[PDB]
Design a protein around this ligand. Structure first.
Ligand SMILES: COC(O)c1ccc(CN2[C@H](COc3ccccc3)[C@H](O)[C@@H](O)[C@@H](COc3ccccc3)N(Cc3ccc(CO)cc3)S2(=O)=O)cc1
Lengths: 99, 99
C-alpha cells in the first residue's frame, strides 16, 4: 500500500503470537520493541538517539509479520516508549520512500 | 525518486545558503537540526526520543531545500545525533512510504 505521512505511520505486527502496534521508522537502523519475553539467547547492547541511550537485549533471527508480510531479523528489546520497526526489517518487506 | 532502505536515507539539504546532510525520518513528527544560527525569534519545545526528552529551539517559516524540493516550515534546533527531516516537511515534498 501507499502510506501518507499526515499521521504517524503506525501498523499492526505479529511477534511471538502477540499483536502489537508499531511505528515504521526509516530513521532507525534496527528494530526495537517494548519489554517482552522472547526465546533463545541474547546479547546486551546500548542504543542511543534524542534524549540519550538505553540498554536493550539483542535477539537474532526473530520472525515478525508486518501487515501480512513475513520477515526475519534482529529485534532489540528494552524500555523504549514506542515499538519501532527499523530499516533491518523494512527492507525485507520491500518498503521504499517515494517523492 | 524512489529511495531504498538498505542504507540510511541520507539526503542533501540547503538551509541558510549552506549544504548539509540530513536523515529522512518517518518516525519523527518534527524536523530537528544540529546547532546553527537561524533568523527571527524562537519558542521553547520539548521533544522525546528513545532516551528521554530534550529542550530545543523552535523557529517558524524557515526556508529549506530538500533534494532540490523547496519547503517552508517549522525547524527545531538542538542536541540531536544527526540532522533529522520529520513528517512536517516530508508531507510538504509529497513523500510517502510504499510496499
Ligand atoms: C512517546 O514516544 C514517542 O512518541 C517516540 C516517537 C519516536 C521515537 C524515535 N526517535 C526519533 C524521533 O525524533 C523526533 C524528532 C522530532 C519530534 C519528535 C521525535 C527518530 O524517529 C528515530 O529514527 C531515531 C533517531 O535517532 C538516531 C540516532 C543515531 C543515528 C540515526 C538516528 N530514534 C532512535 C533510534 C536509534 C537506534 C535504533 C536502533 O538502531 C532505533 C531508534 S529516536 O531518536 O529515538 C522515540 C519516541
Amino acid at each position: 500500500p501507499q502510506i501518507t505521512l499526515w499521521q504517524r505511520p503506525l501498523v499492526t505486527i505479529k511477534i511471538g503470537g502477540q499483536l502489537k502496534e508499531a511505528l515504521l521508522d526509516t530513521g532507525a537502523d534496527d528494530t526495537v520493541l517494548e519489554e517482552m519475553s522472547l526465546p533463545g539467547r541474547w546479547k546486551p547492547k546500548m542504543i542511543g538517539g534524542i534524549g540519550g541511550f538505553i540498554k536493550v537485549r539483542q535477539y537474532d533471527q526473530i520472525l515478525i509479520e508486518i501487515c501480512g508480510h513475513k520477515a526475519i531479523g534482529t529485534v532489540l528489546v528494552g524500555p523504549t516508549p514506542v515499538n519501532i520497526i527499523g530499516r533491518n526489517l523494512l527492507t525485507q518487506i520491500g518498503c521504499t520512500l517515494n517523492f
